[model samples]
Target: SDADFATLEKTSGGRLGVCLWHPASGARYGHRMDERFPMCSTVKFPLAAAILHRVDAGKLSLDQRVAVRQGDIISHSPFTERHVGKDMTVRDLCRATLIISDNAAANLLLPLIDGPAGLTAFLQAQGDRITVSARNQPELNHFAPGDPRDTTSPAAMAGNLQRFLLGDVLSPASRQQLADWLIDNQTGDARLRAGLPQGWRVGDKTGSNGQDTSNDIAALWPLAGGAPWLLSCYLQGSALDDDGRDGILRQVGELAGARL
Candidate 1:
């Protein structure tokens, strides 16, 4: 297992940070876990949470129709063409944001939750002090206003996710809503899921800057009933395609998951 974790250190051509956590026991497995790297789309998980908090406050409705912009659906998988001028429910946007890592879906949700300010406040409330999240989907995809790229320390990212999922935040109903989508996440087959014990549920998110950055973080289940293990792995300066990048992620997740 040490060998496996060791290999993950070389996963990206550049630097990397990884951590596998157990919330109930206060255990930690890490390698440069405190390092900050581009979170990319993985920010969507917390993005969804802040949106749900708004829902809890009766400021947004899951079934309420939100206008779709042609730009949100661009180049983002899970939705190839823009729904342009069509209306999709907030529930649909959540699905797109998480399932396909759809940028447009996230862009639409950004303003409603009052932008990065709300996401920052959300993370602060959960005791996360290190991740720098700025801008929304499309802005994050390229060089744009305000430094454009979001960042996270693997430790902070994993730690915050563990606390939130462990009931440090989000109401039960909101939790269910978020969980349903994460469980159904239609992406990252090559990460945690690829190496998971068959049929074991993993609630996860994947992120990429479409080049030298790739990441996957999850609350992975055991072969049998037990508290799920939480893991975060983010790579920088790596040059690998879906197949190669995913291979490393699965290798890492497989090892990390086994330790649980």
Candidate 2:
């Protein structure tokens, strides 16, 4: 299997960071899994966790409404394009942020929990010190693949998925809601979700910069039901508009799905 994966990695070019862990079988895979790689919108995973943590503590209400002011808008965002000047709940904001990869919607929630500092701290508390930067996505999205401003290692991102989705630290209700959001994610079909096996359900988040970087982290489940496998992969490229890795990411998903 490593032979097949290694072939894909070579064909893809640039640099790659990957970590695949199967909770059911104890099989693990890695490639530059420890170094920081641009996370793009995949960083939203923990951002949501931080907010959900606030909700869990009664510090914020998911149902509480907030108006979308002009300042919260980001260019070319579907969520912002449709909802600017309208009121939306925190839950709805998370939906747009995760499912649609809406940067503007995520920006709307950034300040509520303390902005970059809060996201950085939340990741640190989860034992990750290398995945996020002290800046916003717009500030970090302009770099080359070898140099990224907002990034995470494959291992850390995998840990984030487990902590946010499977761990007991967060309240179950909040966790379930977040899980539903991820399962409904509309941004990942071109990547990892594309490889899902028959009868398996996948919940994932996709991140891309239209050049340089592309990432997909997912939890895969069989319809028969049981534990799921976690796959976290990030790719950086010399080519423009997505590395050749989208197919490989899906292939990786397909491979995993078959085994499950």
Candidate 3:
């Protein structure tokens, strides 16, 4: 295990932050677990959870449709842009944000949660003090490594994922709704999922800043059966191409998969 951990440091070709937790056994592993990495689209995971929390408490309804104007749509929003003049339900927006990582969908949903600051407050209320959100899309994704405008540590994110998905943070239906969306996530084929052992089931989210940063976070369940383990891999300061950065994430998944 030490060897694997050690290898992870150099194999990444840059700063790598990873945290793996098997909650059933209270096991843990990490490398640069506390270091901040830009959250990028990964913040949408917590943002969706925050929305689901409101749904769980009768504050919002998934079926309620929200207006999406042409102006609300933005880059990398294939889903939203297609229907610029149409309204998307709260559920659909969450799907676009989580499953597809749609930029415009996330931007539209931000106002519902009171924008970036409210999402940060949501994380704080859920006991995650290390992850913060301070800007909207596009701009939020354009931060320097040390800028810290939108960032999360591996340990903090892994914990938050576990609490929100596996714990009582959201009601059963609300939790399942979020989990289903994550399980159906369409954006992580080359990251963590690529290296996971066969038959393992994963509900995950992926993030990228177009350069220098790539990330994947998941609640991974072994095929043999038992509670899922939480794995968060964040690669930063890499000159490697996107696939190369993703390779580091894949290796990280393999490292956790092999040990588990």
Candidate 4:
């Protein structure tokens, strides 16, 4: 067990960081886990949460159809190719945004729900300091306009997920809806699923840059003992090539999942 942690630390190339907590006992292996790195697609988790919050407030309807224009699409996401000119419901976009990590859907939804100013206000209200400073701003041409490429620490991310799981962040029904969406995520190449036992249910989000240099995985899983656990990993500046990164993440996930 001690060896496992040591192996993770060594193999991670000093780019890996983690924070995990057991909900029942308030015990944590890694707490105050504040290490800022690019948010990548992990931003979809918060954006999805905020969207659900708005739905709970009746500001947006899940079934309402929203269309994507060519301009709204981002080059990195598969949605840019499939969703263009298609009329998608808000729920559809939410699914695309979370399950598929669809950038076009997110870009459209961000402006529709909060706009730049409103999203800032919402994050502030939630006491979130994770900087989405460059989102949807024309001034930042280097990044996708609404991409979740900004930075956040593991602690903030864990806190956000904890709130969602505890139903502290959104209404009970809204939280349930969001959790369901997360469980249905089709993209499962990251550590959370790779490490957990087969058939174990996990609500998770995975992030990686197209360049393969930055990657992360975070999740909330209910252990067999009926206790909830929060697991987060952020890997940056990794010398690991694509296959190497995936291997490390899978190994870390298995190690953590088995130990916990």
Identify the leading candidate in terms of lDDT: 3
Clashes of 1: 1
lDDT string for model 1 (97-178, tens) is 8988877778777887778777887787778887767777655544322342477788888886776666647788888778
Candidate 4 — which residues are off by over 4 angstroms?
A: 1-7, 131-133, 136-149, 223-225
Winner on lDDT between 2 and 3 is: 3
Q: What lDDT score belongs to each candidate, Candidate 1 first?
A: 0.76, 0.78, 0.88, 0.67
lDDT of 3 by residue, 1-260 (tens): 64676677686677888999988899999788898988899999999998988888888888888887888878899888887677989999999999999999999888888899999999999898888899999888776756777999999999988999899999998898888998999989889998888878899999998878899999987678878899998888788879898888888878887877
* Decreasing TM-score order of the candidates: 3, 2, 1, 4
Worst 10 residues of 1 by lDDT: 140-149
- Candidate 1: the clashing residue pairs are 72-104
Model 4, 142-234: lDDT tens digits are 233234446666677776777776647799888888888878887765556766766456887776664544444455565454766777666
Clashing pairs in 3: none
Per-model tally of clashing residue pairs: 1, 2, 0, 3
TM-score of each: 0.89, 0.91, 0.96, 0.84
The segments of candidate 2 whose C-alpha lies over 4 angstroms from its true place after superposition are: 144-149, 238-240
What is the TM-score of candidate 4?
0.84
TM-score, model 1 to reference: 0.89
* Candidate number with greatest TM-score: 3
Off by over 4 Å in 1: 1-4, 71-73, 77-82, 141-149
